[PDB]
Design a protein around this ligand. Structure first.
Ligand SMILES: [Mg+2]
Ligand SMILES: [Mg+2]
Ligand SMILES: [Mg+2]
Lengths: 178, 183, 120
RNA sequence: GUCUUGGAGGUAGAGCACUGAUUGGACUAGGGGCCCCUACCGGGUUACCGAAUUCAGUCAAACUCCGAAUGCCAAUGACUU
RNA sequence: UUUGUUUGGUGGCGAUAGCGAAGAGGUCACACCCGUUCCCAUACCGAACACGGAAGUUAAGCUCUUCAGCGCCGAUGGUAGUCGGGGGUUUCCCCCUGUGAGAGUAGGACGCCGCCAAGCAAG
């Protein structure tokens, strides 16, 4: 838990003095995070495999909630209210501790320590991540038979310019194109 | 010599029981145009020193008349009688005439519109944000310098526009924060 | 990046929804209730003339109990406004819920005023 | 019957706010074709189709942000019958 | 006790109340804000909803002051049309006593009108 403690300790005065804000309430600190599996057989035609749901459970704090389709996607045929992938939201200390367990192991669990530079944002403060990889935590090594387990984890902040996202993900330390 | 502006007749009697100076009533939050003109001529001929309670209506009328007529002198209820638990309460009718004499001793606004040396950054470095020390030490230093309390930005603004020594006030700040620590 | 809307706005919309289906006349004046982060308030209101007939709140001089935001404080203010309405000569009233949920604080107030003599 | 007053309704006319139709400019990634060379880059063009978008300009029985004259339904008064 | 005034609540009038921009303000009040032990709650989440608490803050919401940029309202006059009466070379046009739009324009306008409570002031 101590992560967000020391994060306050450092960032509040640091980001206040480097960016002169009139009020402290203006400091952009992270609030919420969501990961989107968005697979559901990835084609919805396997129609029977949902290992995604339980791996999402025990890699996260809670269990996900399965999404569904709404319209008729041309790239597919059986898409009418059927379920495709799930999602997980979290903002409390589960958020922070998952962030820590991420930056601790999955950042070494990469094949390259360069991550991605700040080229995949939405200007006013956010960060998508690219997940076509397979192994996040060794919690799933042989139980998983290396089937495609990608994700879409999106962290978002109360910022207004991309530079804030940059500085925020740097001050805690994320692999970029340094 | 100067004129003293106060809320009503109670503060009138109170201030008159302390020092010989003519009184102008503000009659609460309701201040009139001709009243502002009277304040103008008073500051022009004899001067005026606002002295109200550090409460909501008192501070509000103080701010309004300050923004109304610049150069008008100001005074503040010292830390003892400015608080309701002392004497009868917060009203000027509740302070001692000697306390009014001290407030007269701490009159300010001889300086109005100066570019000075009071840094907001070092100010937050001194711990005037969060942790209850923001408002605690704000009140403490305000009643220390006998200037009243405010929020961080407003207190910083009035100090940064109030011509006083910087590092002597910083030493007094160390003294007061040690009082909070127990010194 | 994100924005967060005023909770009071949604409360106002829900209050309008509720008040759509009822109104307080000079015989069944509606009894309104307002919750704050610190206090609670209640006003007996007729609609056809836009007048207030009775009121009560934690901000009274009386009720030396100082824990405003209580469920118990809600009971006290409810019984007080009930007595005020009674002495003014009011028996039965409809009762909105502002826009809140019929639950702890507001419902406690409602029950207190209810047993105290009001017919609702 | 007339005078006075109050109503409901989308025609004539008008208009482009919606749905269709439509002219001439601006502007276009997406280039379609020419090619430089395009095996592939990247580039003049794209004769862009240049999609929108925008600027002006015309239409509608099954278009309407508007909208009469008349006619219709009542009233309480009056004058006639 | 009445009166004045500010704020919070709660109503009535067609947005002339709207958007947009620029500012000032919070120790009262309103708010953000701080936690989840039980009330209660989430298809996951104290996000929201509930319950307790008051550390900080005007940053946002909220209140006040400015702007006619967008939206809104809107004449007078003049034409189109048309009831009734006439005349023509009749898929239409002309005249006469009356009615009289749409568009466009002058312009108006960044609100008025109540009740209750609290705060201050005066009586
Ligand atoms: Mg026509
Ligand atoms: Mg038509
Ligand atoms: Mg017109």
């Amino acid at each position: 838990n101590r992560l967000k403690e020391k994060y306050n300790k450092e960032i509040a005065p640091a980001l206040m003095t480097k960016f002169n804000y009139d009020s402290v309430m203006q400091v952009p600190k992270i609030e919420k995070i969501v990961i989107n599996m968005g697979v559901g057989d990835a084609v919805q035609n396997a129609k029977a495999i949902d290992s995604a749901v339980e791996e999402l459970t025990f890699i996260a704090g809670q269990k996900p909630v399965v999404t569904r389709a709404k319209k008729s996607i041309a790239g597919f045929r059986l898409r009418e209210g059927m379920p495709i992938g799930a999602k997980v939201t979290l903002r409390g200390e589960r958020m922070y501790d998952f962030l820590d367990k991420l930056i601790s192991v999955s950042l070494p669990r990469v094949r390259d320590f360069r991550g991605v530079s700040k080229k995949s944002f939405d200007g006013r403060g956010n960060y998508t991540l690219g997940i076509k990889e397979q192994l996040i935590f060794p919690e799933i090594d042989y139980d998983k038979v290396t089937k495609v387990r990608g994700m879409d984890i999106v962290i978002v902040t109360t910022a207004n310019t991309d530079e804030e996202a940059r500085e925020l993900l740097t001050q805690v330390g994320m692999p970029f194109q340094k | 010599k100067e004129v003293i502006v106060v809320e009503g007749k109670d503060d009138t009697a109170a201030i008159r029981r302390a020092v010989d100076a003519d009184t102008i009533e503000t009659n609460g939050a309701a201040v009139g145009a001709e009243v502002i003109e009277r304040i103008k001529l008073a500051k022009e001929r004899r001067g005026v020193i606002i002295f109200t309670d550090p409460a909501f209506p008192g501070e509000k009328i103080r701010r309004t008349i300050a923004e109304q007529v610049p150069g008008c002198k100001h005074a503040f209820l010292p830390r003892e009688a400015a608080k309701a638990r002392s004497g009868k309460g917060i009203g000027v009718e509740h302070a001692s005439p000697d306390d009014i004499r001290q407030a007269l001793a701490n009159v300010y606004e001889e300086t109005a519109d100066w570019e000075e040396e009071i840094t907001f950054a070092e100010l937050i470095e001194a711990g005037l944000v969060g942790g209850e020390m923001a408002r605690r030490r704000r009140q403490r230093l305000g009643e220390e310098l006998k200037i009243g309390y405010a929020n961080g930005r407003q207190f910083h603004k009035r100090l940064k526009v109030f011509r006083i020594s910087r590092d002597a006030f910083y030493a007094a700040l160390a003294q007061v924060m040690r009082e909070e620590a127990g010194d | 990046m994100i924005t967060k809307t005023s909770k009071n706005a949604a409360r106002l919309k829900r209050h309008a929804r509720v008040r759509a289906k009822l109104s307080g006349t000079a015989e069944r004046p509606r009894l309104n209730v307002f919750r704050s982060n610190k206090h609670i308030y209640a006003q007996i209101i007729d609609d056809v003339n836009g007048v207030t007939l009775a009121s009560a709140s934690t901000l009274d001089k009386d009720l030396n109990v100082e824990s405003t935001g209580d469920t118990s404080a809600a009971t006290k203010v409810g019984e007080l406004v009930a007595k005020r309405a009674a002495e003014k000569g009011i028996s039965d009233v409809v009762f909105d819920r502002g826009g809140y949920l019929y639950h702890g604080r507001v419902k406690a107030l409602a029950d207190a005023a209810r047993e105290a003599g009001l017919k609702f």
